[PDB]
Scaffold this active site. Structure first.
Site, mmCIF file in Angstrom:
data_model
loop_
_atom_site.group_PDB
_atom_site.id
_atom_site.type_symbol
_atom_site.label_atom_id
_atom_site.label_comp_id
_atom_site.label_asym_id
_atom_site.label_seq_id
_atom_site.Cartn_x
_atom_site.Cartn_y
_atom_site.Cartn_z
ATOM 1 N N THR A 267 43.891 19.098 42.149
ATOM 2 C CA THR A 267 44.732 18.758 43.322
ATOM 3 C C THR A 267 45.126 17.285 43.335
ATOM 4 O O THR A 267 46.309 16.978 43.209
ATOM 5 C CB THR A 267 44.005 19.138 44.618
ATOM 6 O OG1 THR A 267 42.797 18.378 44.752
ATOM 7 C CG2 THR A 267 43.726 20.623 44.670
ATOM 8 N N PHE A 392 47.719 20.518 53.219
ATOM 9 C CA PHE A 392 46.264 20.756 53.281
ATOM 10 C C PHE A 392 45.960 22.055 54.021
ATOM 11 O O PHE A 392 44.813 22.255 54.443
ATOM 12 C CB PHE A 392 45.571 19.546 53.899
ATOM 13 C CG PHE A 392 45.636 18.291 53.065
ATOM 14 C CD1 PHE A 392 44.912 18.187 51.893
ATOM 15 C CD2 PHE A 392 46.458 17.232 53.420
ATOM 16 C CE1 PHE A 392 44.931 17.033 51.130
ATOM 17 C CE2 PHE A 392 46.536 16.095 52.622
ATOM 18 C CZ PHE A 392 45.760 15.991 51.491
ATOM 19 N N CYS A 399 42.004 22.216 54.343
ATOM 20 C CA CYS A 399 41.250 21.497 53.314
ATOM 21 C C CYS A 399 40.103 20.686 53.912
ATOM 22 O O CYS A 399 40.345 19.748 54.685
ATOM 23 C CB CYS A 399 42.201 20.566 52.603
ATOM 24 S SG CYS A 399 41.398 19.649 51.282
HETATM 25 C C1 HEM Z 1 38.219 16.291 45.843
HETATM 26 C C2 HEM Z 1 39.305 16.768 46.453
HETATM 27 C C3 HEM Z 1 39.308 18.032 47.234
HETATM 28 C C4 HEM Z 1 38.277 18.862 47.592
HETATM 29 C C5 HEM Z 1 36.819 18.634 47.274
HETATM 30 C C6 HEM Z 1 38.821 19.964 48.325
HETATM 31 C C7 HEM Z 1 38.039 21.036 48.805
HETATM 32 C C8 HEM Z 1 38.601 22.130 49.480
HETATM 33 C C9 HEM Z 1 37.847 23.153 50.094
HETATM 34 C C10 HEM Z 1 36.338 23.276 50.025
HETATM 35 C C11 HEM Z 1 38.716 23.999 50.731
HETATM 36 C C12 HEM Z 1 38.346 25.230 51.534
HETATM 37 C C13 HEM Z 1 38.078 24.853 53.016
HETATM 38 C C14 HEM Z 1 37.619 26.044 53.825
HETATM 39 O O1 HEM Z 1 38.303 27.089 53.842
HETATM 40 O O2 HEM Z 1 36.558 25.983 54.506
HETATM 41 C C15 HEM Z 1 40.027 23.490 50.496
HETATM 42 C C16 HEM Z 1 41.179 24.082 50.996
HETATM 43 C C17 HEM Z 1 42.451 23.578 50.692
HETATM 44 N N1 HEM Z 1 42.739 22.430 50.005
HETATM 45 FE FE1 HEM Z 1 41.511 21.076 49.373
HETATM 46 N N2 HEM Z 1 40.160 19.818 48.373
HETATM 47 C C18 HEM Z 1 40.532 18.671 47.777
HETATM 48 C C19 HEM Z 1 41.812 18.149 47.580
HETATM 49 C C20 HEM Z 1 42.979 18.798 47.931
HETATM 50 C C21 HEM Z 1 44.285 18.271 47.811
HETATM 51 C C22 HEM Z 1 44.603 16.921 47.231
HETATM 52 C C23 HEM Z 1 45.154 19.233 48.305
HETATM 53 C C24 HEM Z 1 46.615 19.254 48.392
HETATM 54 C C25 HEM Z 1 47.338 18.327 47.812
HETATM 55 C C26 HEM Z 1 44.369 20.348 48.702
HETATM 56 C C27 HEM Z 1 44.903 21.462 49.319
HETATM 57 C C28 HEM Z 1 44.092 22.420 49.937
HETATM 58 C C29 HEM Z 1 44.706 23.604 50.595
HETATM 59 C C30 HEM Z 1 46.186 23.904 50.667
HETATM 60 C C31 HEM Z 1 43.678 24.351 51.059
HETATM 61 C C32 HEM Z 1 43.800 25.668 51.809
HETATM 62 C C33 HEM Z 1 43.747 26.877 50.866
HETATM 63 C C34 HEM Z 1 44.012 28.221 51.525
HETATM 64 O O3 HEM Z 1 44.363 28.318 52.729
HETATM 65 O O4 HEM Z 1 43.884 29.259 50.823
HETATM 66 N N3 HEM Z 1 43.039 20.057 48.464
HETATM 67 N N4 HEM Z 1 39.952 22.318 49.739
HETATM 68 C C1 LIG Z 2 38.024 26.606 44.270
HETATM 69 C C2 LIG Z 2 39.289 26.776 44.638
HETATM 70 C C3 LIG Z 2 40.114 25.950 45.532
HETATM 71 C C4 LIG Z 2 41.296 26.458 46.051
HETATM 72 C C5 LIG Z 2 42.107 25.723 46.914
HETATM 73 C C6 LIG Z 2 41.752 24.440 47.260
HETATM 74 C C7 LIG Z 2 40.570 23.894 46.748
HETATM 75 C C8 LIG Z 2 39.755 24.638 45.885
#
Ligand code: HEM
Ligand SMILES: C=Cc1ccccc1
Ligand SMILES: CCCCCCCN1CCC[C@H]1C(=O)N[C@@H](Cc1ccccc1)C(=O)O
Ligand SMILES: [Cl-]
Length: 454
Positions: A267, A392, A399
């Site tokens: 990401t 996000f 996120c």
């Molecule tokens: C070290 C960096 C990152 C970590 C550790 C991280 C971790 C996660 C986690 C654990 C979730 C699930 C949250 C939940 O449902 O309880 C998530 C969801 C998400 N993250 Fe991040 N993330 C990071 C960076 C990013 C970045 C930079 C973006 C976008 C540019 C991104 C976009 C998203 C999106 C769109 C979701 C929602 C997915 C869905 O609805 O299916 N993430 N992330």
């Molecule tokens: C492990 C899968 C995942 C998917 C979407 C956002 C961050 C992590």
């Protein structure tokens, strides 16, 4: 009530062959440009609806009406990410338990504790570029992926992947990348039980074993030593869910680490790559961002509070997320029968896909300059209507890493702009590779050091 549009069909395969491409999200964006704010997509045994307008996505984001669905992509990733936060259903016990335990470890306040480790990897990147010979170039997504993976390894479980010491990734990363490739390839694999794919299946099981063995061993090592670090693994070992009163089990801690490693690799690196791409293509914006970096980053090592002061760099990152949100879609299901937008009746269980790059091109929100890279459109964010900007995701399933990703990207981009001038020496033509996420492929630049010591 309106009948929604549908793209071209392939007989019994319905719309499925439209995604038989290395760039299926970009294909869906062109379909959205033709068909508008909503279209039906059918495949053997399934249907979903792609949403592109803020008008409809605002309603999709109503958690009383819609909950997170696991896309087929996330269901395939679940074979190695398990019931980690990103691949769990909201109703699974381990979702709310891990959410409650981890949320305080991902807050803005928590970033103060990760800052020093983020600086360690950021300085490794700056030193790499300082040490290049004249007219050598930078492989941008390659180096941004080295940085973001090493940052989450060091902040996630105090583990050094040492990506800047390597041409070929750490074996764990080779296995994670090949597993992510198998997961996404299976979306377009006709006859997956064909013996042709026995090798793919054997390799997938081997790659799952490599990831589990490393992560399980580091968890077991940490438990044995009793060592306390400034890391997510320490927080997950010490944490109890206030609701259940239970801690996470060691297997779920492993899935959270694997989940975090997938996110770090996929990401943030894309965001930094797209941000640098837009800066070299918009030199007036690069100059304004570089002036801020020089004004604010007055010390050899950026401080936590200095990163918070890089307001224009934050706007550059938001504008890069607007045009190319690196996690480009999320999926929802209707909790009950409901009408979307006064026009589209949905039944309980009906699925939606939010096409984030298309949402972010809604001219009713952004105006006619929607393809222009203009960070200043983020200067007055209270003027942005609800649910217009969703890089996000949404609501309680948004996120968890947002503050971590934006702190890392702002620090790193700030240091890059402080220490180097950049040249688009190839006049690079944007080419967006699709994995779990979107990244520039083949994006290269030359840096010229400003010769400012660290
Ligand atoms: C070290 C960096 C990152 C970590 C550790 C991280 C971790 C996660 C986690 C654990 C979730 C699930 C949250 C939940 O449902 O309880 C998530 C969801 C998400 N993250 Fe991040 N993330 C990071 C960076 C990013 C970045 C930079 C973006 C976008 C540019 C991104 C976009 C998203 C999106 C769109 C979701 C929602 C997915 C869905 O609805 O299916 N993430 N992330
Ligand atoms: C492990 C899968 C995942 C998917 C979407 C956002 C961050 C992590
Ligand atoms: C972090 C991003 C994760 C999800 C991005 C989705 C990335 N998909 C890659 C192909 C297009 C896009 C998507 O719309 N797929 C859906 C629908 C689908 C199901 C089965 C086969 C093909 C497509 C899905 O996975 O259910
Ligand atoms: Cl047909």
């Amino acid at each position: 009530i309106k009948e929604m549009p549908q793209p071209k069909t392939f007989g019994e395969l319905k719309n499925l062959p439209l995604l038989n491409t290395d760039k299926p999200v970009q294909a869906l964006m062109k379909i959205a440009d033709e068909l508008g704010e909503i279209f039906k997509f059918e495949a053997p045994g399934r249907v979903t609806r792609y949403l592109s307008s803020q008008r409809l996505i605002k309603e999709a984001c109503d958690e009383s009406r819609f909950d997170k669905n696991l896309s087929q992509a996330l269901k395939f990733v679940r074979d190695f990410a398990g019931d980690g936060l990103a691949t769990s259903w909201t109703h699974e016990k381990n979702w709310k338990k891990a959410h409650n335990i981890l949320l305080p470890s991902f807050s803005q306040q928590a970033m103060k504790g990760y800052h020093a480790m983020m600086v360690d990897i950021a300085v490794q990147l700056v030193q790499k570029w300082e040490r290049l010979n004249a007219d050598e170039h930078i492989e941008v997504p390659e180096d941004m992926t080295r940085l973001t993976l090493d940052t989450i390894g060091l902040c996630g479980f105090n583990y050094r992947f040492n990506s800047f010491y390597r041409d070929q990734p750490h074996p764990f990363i080779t296995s994670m990348v090949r597993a992510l490739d198998e997961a996404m390839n299976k979306l377009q694999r006709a006859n997956p039980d064909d013996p042709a794919y026995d090798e793919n299946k054997r390799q997938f099981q081997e790659d799952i074993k490599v990831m589990n063995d490393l992560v399980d061993k580091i968890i077991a090592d940490r438990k044995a030593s009793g060592e306390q670090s400034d890391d997510l693994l320490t927080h997950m070992l010490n944490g109890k869910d206030p609701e259940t009163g239970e801690p996470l089990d060691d297997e779920n801690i492993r899935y959270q680490i694997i989940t975090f490693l997938i996110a770090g690799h996929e990401t943030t690196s894309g965001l930094l790559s797209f941000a640098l791409y837009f800066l070299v293509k918009n030199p007036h914006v690069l100059q304004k961002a570089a002036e801020e970096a020089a004004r604010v980053l007055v010390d050899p090592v950026p401080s936590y509070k200095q990163v918070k002061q890089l307001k224009y760099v934050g706007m550059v990152l938001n504008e890069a997320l607007r045009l190319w949100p690196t996690a480009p879609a999320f999926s929802l299901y209707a909790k009950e029968d409901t009408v979307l937008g006064g026009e589209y009746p949905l039944e309980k269980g009906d699925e939606l896909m939010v096409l984030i790059p298309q949402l972010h091109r809604d001219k009713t929100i952004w105006g006619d300059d929607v393809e222009e890279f203009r960070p200043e459109r983020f200067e007055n964010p209270s003027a942005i209507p609800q649910h217009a900007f969703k890089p996000f995701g949404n609501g309680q399933r948004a996120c968890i890493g947002q503050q971590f990703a934006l702190h890392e990207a702002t620090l790193v981009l700030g240091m890059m702009l402080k220490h180097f001038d950049f040249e688009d020496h190839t006049n690079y033509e944007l080419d967006i590779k699709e994995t779990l996420t979107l990244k520039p492929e083949g994006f290269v630049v030359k840096a010229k050091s400003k010769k400012i010591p660290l």
